[PDB]
Write a protein that binds this ligand. Structure first.
Ligand SMILES: *[C@@]1(O)O[C@H](CO)[C@]2(O[C@@]3(O[C@H](CO)[C@@]4(O[C@]5(O[C@H](CO)[C@@H](O)[C@]6(O[C@@]7(O[C@H](CO)[C@@H](O)[C@H](O)[C@@H]7O)O6)[C@@H]5O)O4)[C@H](O)[C@H]3NC(C)=O)O2)[C@H](O)[C@H]1NC(C)=O
Ligand SMILES: CC(=O)N[C@H]1[C@H](O)O[C@H](CO)[C@]2(O[C@@]3(O[C@H](CO)[C@@]4(O[C@]5(O[C@H](CO)[C@@H](O)[C@]6(O[C@@]7(O[C@H](CO)[C@@H](O)[C@H](O)[C@@H]7O)O6)[C@@H]5O)O4)[C@H](O)[C@H]3NC(C)=O)O2)[C@@H]1O
Ligand SMILES: *[C@@]1(O)O[C@H](CO)[C@]2(O[C@@]3(O[C@H](CO)[C@]4(O[C@@]5(O[C@H](CO)[C@@H](O)[C@H](O)[C@@H]5O)O4)[C@H](O)[C@H]3NC(C)=O)O2)[C@H](O)[C@H]1NC(C)=O
Ligand SMILES: CC(=O)N[C@@H]1[C@@H](O)[C@H](O[C@]2(O)O[C@H](CO)[C@]3(O[C@@]4(O[C@H](CO)[C@@H](O)[C@H](O)[C@@H]4O)O3)[C@H](O)[C@H]2NC(C)=O)[C@@H](CO)O[C@H]1O
Ligand SMILES: *[C@@]1(O)O[C@H](CO)[C@]2(O[C@@]3(O[C@H](CO)[C@@H](O)[C@H](O)[C@H]3NC(C)=O)O2)[C@H](O)[C@H]1NC(C)=O
Ligand SMILES: *[C@@]1(O)O[C@H](CO)[C@]2(O[C@@]3(O[C@H](CO)[C@@H](O)[C@H](O)[C@H]3NC(C)=O)O2)[C@H](O)[C@H]1NC(C)=O
Ligand SMILES: *[C@@]1(O)O[C@H](CO)[C@]2(O[C@@]3(O[C@H](CO)[C@@H](O)[C@H](O)[C@H]3NC(C)=O)O2)[C@H](O)[C@H]1NC(C)=O
Ligand SMILES: CC(=O)N[C@H]1[C@H](O)O[C@H](CO)[C@]2(O[C@@]3(O[C@H](CO)[C@@H](O)[C@H](O)[C@H]3NC(C)=O)O2)[C@@H]1O
Ligand SMILES: CC(=O)N[C@H]1[C@H](O)O[C@H](CO)[C@]2(O[C@@]3(O[C@H](CO)[C@@H](O)[C@H](O)[C@H]3NC(C)=O)O2)[C@@H]1O
Ligand SMILES: CC(=O)N[C@H]1[C@H](O)O[C@H](CO)[C@]2(O[C@@]3(O[C@H](CO)[C@@H](O)[C@H](O)[C@H]3NC(C)=O)O2)[C@@H]1O
Ligand SMILES: *[C@@]1(O)O[C@H](CO)[C@@H](O)[C@H](O)[C@H]1NC(C)=O
Ligand SMILES: *[C@@]1(O)O[C@H](CO)[C@@H](O)[C@H](O)[C@H]1NC(C)=O
Ligand SMILES: *[C@@]1(O)O[C@H](CO)[C@@H](O)[C@H](O)[C@H]1NC(C)=O
Ligand SMILES: CC(=O)N[C@@H]1[C@@H](O)[C@H](O)[C@@H](CO)O[C@H]1O
Lengths: 193, 371, 413, 99, 49
């Protein structure tokens, strides 16, 4: 039950600030109008992954990342919880702890670059259900942990879109504030090219 | 401001005194260009207090005291039309301030309005503007009475034509294409020159303090050398681009100086040099990085077909026109100036006599009235 | 200028003799609050330690280690580091840090070192030959000696321990040909003994608590780094600064631009750092390259005089006879006049300097030309009544010297 | 070592020849202007103003210079101007006379 | 058409972009030259038969 990934799905590349300037960035992104595999389980992690979920009753919980998830090698086990979000390298679902971290439409972007896990999230006042409307938003609230393994599983525990990032350059327009108001995709179309 | 890089650069040689010398050369060349183009007036000419230039209206191109910049309305429009200190790059201010250039053009304009072309030759000798326009019509071949009989119409045409320029400048975008292109090219050159710093150039890292910090000096020397050679190459490229573009702009500035001389200061017979049509006069306006010439030209219109003859054969001799052309409306023959149809009775006074009838081909029999 | 022109006589003109950059003072460094610190306290002040045969290993990760607490302490008997400088790793990071703690006796502390042999080094705790780390030990007679802890060590083993190996098996050691049946007997011994830690023992026989920090530094991510000193900031003073690993020289000032809660430092254009937020106070600052510009002298020519007027380009000269600010920079040593003359030496921004009488260099706003208002009227004409013929010279270069360079003889020879 | 020396000396020779090309282009512009002056101001009388001296051009003479040419422009400069009242036409017998 | 060379070339910077821009400027200038020289006539004129 695929559905085109629209304009949405772009994140802030780096920490820097840019005011009213156009920039070109070369790293993993989610392609414009790329049919993501809406799930209504099992999901691979060939590369960085855009995860977008809508829950009226907030059924979905944290993501159980794992390279093997056979208890032989360390997992990542992002979970979330009313009071706090807890993530450990180590309820109903189960399967040498290295590191644990505890801290505080629903855009989510997860990627692993040179062993560093990065998370980008956004909250939107959605008004139309069962479709992600083409629009623009991004942020970088993240937690970095030096795992150094290639995650390949999601096992998210009431439907979520999932798309795969690809290494294609983008041109991002910057607002006066420094936020990314708009972007265009270089290889999407000859006009955008 | 890195000392070890300073030494490694020092060992390359005299490249930088050479680059600085080239850049300072083009820098002073720019001032020479502006001064050569605009400073063709010996002494700044004030315009008279009351403007009664025979019905012609110069309010738009003449300076207005109310404005603080003391530049004409069209000059301010041209300034608004265009839209014009990081690491070792400095922009030196032009020797002639914009106000000084406006004053130059105001002086030239007052001189050409009041004294015609006399001020370019020497002392400024004043003629009533109507009589000067008659001089210029004689210059383009039309007799001077044509202006005086039609002075109000010519004034209205000139005023409305100047009015059209204001609409063209204010509304039509990218009117000042060449000047804006100059500004954009210079901004592009400086911007790419600054961008080259971030480039790696084959070293481990672009930022020089970092390459210094995390390697031993013997090993760091090689990476620093790669950075230096790359940056020096980029700077040399920028300098040579500037040299060539400065040559092109010098050619354009020499052309502007020649047009200022040959068209503002005097009337020119070079066809299509200043405008389309027979050239009457031209006015200079100061744009930000250049000069804008308003060319007042005379273009004939509403032509009429006529039957013509090379000479009139009367009493066994051929009469040729002194300055006109024989024209026939079907039954009568007249002598008219070529540029303006103003017929006159063929007479011995305005037609000279040479030879006899038989030799010249195409002549027509008629009577040449003798006063 | 005589130096940079390679002459003892320079003509009237303005020559860019050098460049002038304000030098930075009192460089500053800043790094965010050290809120999270490494648990060396729960390793060193652990109430109970561990027997040397079952030595305890503590993995240090995801923390900032202030090693100064260790070597500035005056309560250690031995602090032997191998292949690493404890005073030099407070600005260093490690891919892996291990902390091994156990208890031995005095004459056995010398065995916790690479290339050693003995009961402890062969059967309990072995360090590799290329060991990188520190061996820290101190007397623990006041804690591990009463008249109720039970510390053990291994007596025998069928082979020596590999580095960082740990054997906790309590199987009977077979010393002879006959095989034991999990029971002690002839040529069969239990492999563990207790230490006889009596408070009245000799110093070499009293217990010593030992901590062995070992480090690894591969081309891999790291999580154990030491603390970073930070100092107060300045304003409106050209300073070399370090903000969160970003080094730069400039004048820091208050900035109206607002970052977003995640953005650290900003670049206005062309990848040049123009703003930066300090990690401590969470405040944005704007960086401006502290004033720099060419210094160029104005000289009327040596034979005329030896006076010079310095021009520091585009520098508001509140800093280094009469100092006159002009729109082209600062002029030092040139009197400013109110009247105006024809331009002699082009300074810039509509200002020229010249040498005139007593006998001083004066800077003035150049005069475009004389002012006259030719008397226009609608019925007035000015007719020449005489004339002068004039010959003038126009000089034009038409050629150059036809130079020819032998490429090979010039390059190699 | 010879590689480093070759690269440096080659770069220097290259920048020298490029600057020589640009300077030669400037000199060619100047020489074309001098040829235009010698053709329009010595071989004839020129009406285009301030091309050859300040004033109305009478004639001009060339003189050989070391690496160029020096024109002596003989021009006619009006002087000793006098004021007069003026008018475009003259009414006589009901007809306008223009000069 | 070697990717290994192209990645190394990226480090040098905007040299290829600069060269392409210079060459395309020369290219459009050539059309401008021909247009300026020959397109002096508003409307095509035919000689009488
Ligand atoms: C035309 O428009 O301009 C020319 C300018 O060259 C004009 O010619 C000048 O006329 C002067 C008046 O006669 C001339 O000055 C005198 O020349 C005689 C020699 O012929 C000389 O002896 C003279 O000096 C004496 O008188 C003066 C004045 O009284 C006195 O101060 C002396 O101490 C001495 O006693 O000296 C005068 O110098 O002046 C000029 O020589 C003469 N210039 C030339 C090149 O010939 O010519 C025209 O007269 C003038 N035309 C018109 C119609 O205005
Ligand atoms: C376009 C036009 O009107 N052209 C006129 C011009 O305006 O005025 C000239 C002056 O008269 C006009 O020249 C005349 O041209 C005639 C035509 O050639 C000319 O007629 C002949 O000339 C012969 C030369 O002497 C003459 O022998 C000729 O007469 C014979 O032929 C005629 C027939 O053509 C017979 O009728 C006669 O009886 C006789 O047999 O005589 C003609 O006289 O005609 C006139 O002589 C020309 N006039 C003069 C003064 O030379 O030139 C011109 O056509
Ligand atoms: C930020 O980066 O961008 C925003 C949007 O472009 C920017 O917000 C606006 O800024 C205006 C001027 O600061 C604001 O005008 C004032 O608003 C006051 C109430 O908020 C009002 O009392 C004043 O009279 C005035 O009208 O105008 C806008 O309100 C404001 N928009 C909002 C808050 O939605 O926002 C903002 O300025 C800019 N950040 C900075 C630091 O400039
Ligand atoms: C000032 C003046 O009156 N000049 C006239 C001049 O206009 C006229 O020549 C034309 O003027 O030329 C056109 C060519 O476009 C010509 O017209 C033709 O008409 C036929 C049909 O009638 C079309 O099929 C052709 O394609 C062409 O358009 O028009 C014709 O020669 C003139 N047109 C007119 C008079 O309307 C010449 C004619 O000798 O006379 C000058 O005095
Ligand atoms: C840093 O770690 O520690 C500072 C020391 O207190 C802390 O600074 C305080 O910041 C609050 C925020 O408004 C001010 O109200 C206090 O006056 C100020 N106190 C001092 C002594 O500076 O500074 C700072 O907030 C804190 N930063 C972080 C990120 O923990
Ligand atoms: C200089 O040439 O012109 C100045 C014009 O401002 C002159 O400065 C003024 O001098 C008068 C008389 O002393 C004062 O009453 C004004 O306040 C003063 N104005 C300013 C702005 O300073 O300044 C100045 O005196 C004059 N100097 C000379 C040597 O002529
Ligand atoms: C010309 O014929 O008449 C002008 C007006 O009378 C003359 O210009 C004035 O001359 C007087 C005396 O030289 C000056 O004091 C005035 O400033 C000057 N300008 C005016 C009144 O606007 O102008 C002019 O000199 C005169 N020309 C000649 C050649 O005599
Ligand atoms: C209902 C509830 O609070 N559930 C858990 C919540 O979602 O997460 C925290 C994780 O921090 C959980 O509490 C932890 O429980 C373990 C087990 O006893 C303790 O070791 C932790 O200290 C404790 N953490 C906190 C922050 O309370 O609590 C909740 O059970
Ligand atoms: C003598 C004369 O009338 N000169 C006019 C000059 O030639 O053009 C300007 C510009 O239009 C003219 O000034 C404007 O005149 C109109 C009257 O029709 C006024 O309504 C305008 O306010 C006035 N100024 C402008 C800027 O338009 O001025 C002169 O009158
Ligand atoms: C075909 C035609 O009408 N031709 C005219 C020609 O072009 O001009 C002359 C001169 O004006 C014209 O002849 C004159 O016309 C005026 C018209 O107002 C009459 O008043 C004159 O009587 C008449 N004849 C003369 C002046 O001898 O002739 C032609 O009509
Ligand atoms: C503590 O237990 O260990 C510290 C070393 O990590 C030491 O510096 C400190 O003094 C100890 N605390 C005490 C003795 O109270
Ligand atoms: C020069 O300025 O000074 C010399 C004395 O040191 C003198 O001989 C020479 O003539 C002077 N030059 C000029 C042009 O006056
Ligand atoms: C000068 O540069 O700095 C002064 C204090 O910083 C200030 O008062 C003065 O106005 C400044 N002048 C200029 C020309 O910038
Ligand atoms: C068998 C295995 O993988 N053991 C790993 C060890 O290699 C790693 O160095 C350590 C880091 O904390 O974590 C252990 O679980």
């Amino acid at each position: 039950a695929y559905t085109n990934s629209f304009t949405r799905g772009v994140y802030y590349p780096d920490k820097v600030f840019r005011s009213s300037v156009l920039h070109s960035t070369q790293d993993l992104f989610l392609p414009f109008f790329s049919n993501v595999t809406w799930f209504h389980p099992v999901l691979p992690f060939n590369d960085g992954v855009y995860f977008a979920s809508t829950e009226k009753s907030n059924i979905i919980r944290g993501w159980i990342f794992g390279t093997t998830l056979d208890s032989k090698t360390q997992s990542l086990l992002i979970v979330n919880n009313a009071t706090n979000v807890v993530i450990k390298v180590c309820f109903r679902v189960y399967s040498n702890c290295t590191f644990e971290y505890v801290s505080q439409l629903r855009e989510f972007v997860f990627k692993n670059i040179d062993g560093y896990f990065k998370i980008y999230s956004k909250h939107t006042p959605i008004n139309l259900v069962r479709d992600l409307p083409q629009g623009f938003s991004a942020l970088e609230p993240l937690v970095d942990l030096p795992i150094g393994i290639n995650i390949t599983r999601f096992q998210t525990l009431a439907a979520y879109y999932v798309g795969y990032l690809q290494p294609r350059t983008f041109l991002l327009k910057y607002n006066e504030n420094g936020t990314i108001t708009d972007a265009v995709d270089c290889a999407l179309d000859p006009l955008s090219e | 401001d890195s000392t070890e890089c300073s030494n490694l650069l020092l060992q390359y040689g005299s490249f930088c005194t050479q680059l600085n010398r080239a850049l300072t050369g083009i820098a002073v060349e720019q001032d020479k260009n502006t001064q050569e183009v605009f400073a063709q007036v010996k002494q700044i000419y004030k315009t008279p207090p009351i403007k009664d230039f025979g019905g012609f209206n110069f309010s738009q191109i003449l300076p207005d005291p109310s404005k603080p910049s003391k530049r004409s309305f069209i000059e301010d429009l041209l300034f608004n039309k265009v839209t014009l200190k990081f690491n070792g790059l400095t922009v030196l201010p032009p020797l002639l301030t914009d106000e000084m250039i406006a004053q130059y053009t105001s002086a030239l304009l007052a001189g050409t309005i009041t004294s015609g072309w006399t001020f370019g030759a020497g002392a400024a000798l004043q003629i009533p503007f109507a009589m000067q326009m008659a001089y210029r019509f004689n210059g383009i071949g039309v007799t001077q009475n044509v202006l005086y009989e039609n002075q109000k119409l010519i004034a209205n045409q000139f005023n409305s034509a100047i009015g059209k320029i204001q609409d063209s400048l204010s509304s039509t975008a990218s009117a000042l294409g060449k000047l804006q292109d100059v500004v954009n090219q210079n901004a592009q050159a400086l911007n790419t020159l600054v961008k080259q710093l971030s480039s790696n150039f084959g070293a481990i890292s672009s930022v020089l303090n970092d390459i210094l910090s995390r390697l031993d000096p013997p090993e760091a020397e090689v990476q620093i050398d790669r950075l230096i050679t790359g940056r020096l190459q980029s700077l040399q490229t920028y300098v040579t681009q500037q040299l060539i573009r400065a040559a092109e702009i010098r050619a354009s500035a020499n052309l502007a100086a020649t047009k200022m001389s040959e068209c503002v200061l005097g009337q020119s017979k070079r066809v299509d040099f200043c405008g389309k049509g027979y050239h009457l006069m031209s006015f200079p306006q100061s744009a930000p990085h250049g000069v804008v010439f308003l060319h007042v030209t005379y273009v004939p219109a509403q032509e009429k077909n006529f039957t013509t003859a090379p000479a009139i054969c009367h009493d066994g001799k051929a009469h040729f026109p002194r300055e006109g052309v024989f024209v026939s409306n079907g039954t009568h023959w007249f002598v008219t100036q070529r540029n303006f149809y103003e017929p006159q009775i063929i007479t011995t006074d305005n037609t000279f006599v040479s030879g006899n009838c038989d030799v010249v081909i195409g002549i027509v029999n008629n009577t040449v009235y003798d006063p | 200028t005589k130096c940079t022109l390679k002459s003892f006589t320079v003509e009237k003109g303005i020559y860019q003799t050098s460049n002038f950059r304000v030098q930075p003072t009192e460089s500053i460094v800043r790094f965010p609050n050290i809120t999270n610190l490494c648990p060396f306290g729960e390793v060193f002040n652990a109430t109970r330690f561990a027997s040397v045969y079952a030595w305890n290993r503590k993995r240090i990760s995801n923390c900032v280690a202030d090693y100064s607490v260790l070597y500035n302490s005056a309560s250690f008997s031995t602090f032997k580091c191998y292949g690493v400088s404890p005073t030099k790793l407070n600005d260093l990071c490690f891919t892996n840090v291990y902390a091994d703690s156990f208890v031995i006796r005095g004459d056995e502390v010398r065995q916790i070192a690479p290339g050693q042999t003995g009961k402890i080094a062969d059967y309990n705790y072995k360090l590799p030959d290329d060991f990188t780390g520190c061996v820290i030990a101190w007397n623990s007679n006041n804690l591990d000696s009463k008249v109720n802890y039970n510390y053990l060590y291994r007596l025998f083993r069928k082979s020596n321990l590999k580095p960082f190996e740990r054997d906790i098996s309590t199987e009977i050691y077979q010393a002879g040909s006959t095989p034991c049946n999990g029971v002690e007997g002839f040529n069969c011994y239990f492999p563990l003994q207790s230490y006889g830690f009596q408070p009245t023992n000799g110093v070499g026989y009293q217990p010593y608590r030992v901590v062995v920090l070992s480090f690894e530094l591969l081309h891999a991510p790291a999580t154990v780094c030491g603390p970073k000193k930070s100092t107060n900031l300045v304003k409106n003073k050209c300073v070399n600064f370090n903000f969160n690993g970003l080094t730069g020289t400039g004048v820091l000032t208050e900035s109206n631009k607002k970052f977003l809660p995640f953005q650290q430092f900003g670049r206005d254009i062309a990848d040049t750092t123009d703003a930066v937020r300090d990690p401590q106070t969470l405040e944005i600052l704007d960086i401006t390259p502290c004033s720099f510009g060419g210094v160029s002298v104005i000289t009327p020519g040596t034979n005329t005089s030896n006076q010079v007027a310095v021009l520091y380009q585009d520098v508001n000269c509140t800093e280094v006879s009469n100092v006159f600010q002009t729109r082209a920079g600062c002029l030092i040593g040139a009197e400013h006049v109110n009247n105006s003359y024809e331009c002699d030496i082009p300074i810039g921004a509509g200002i020229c300097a010249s040498y005139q009488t007593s006998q001083s260099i004066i800077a003035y706003t150049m005069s475009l030309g004389a002012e006259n208002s030719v008397a226009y009227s609608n019925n007035s004409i000015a007719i020449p009544t005489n004339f002068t013929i004039s010959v003038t010279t126009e000089i034009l270069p038409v050629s150059m010297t036809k130079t020819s360079v032998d490429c090979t003889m010039y390059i190699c020879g």
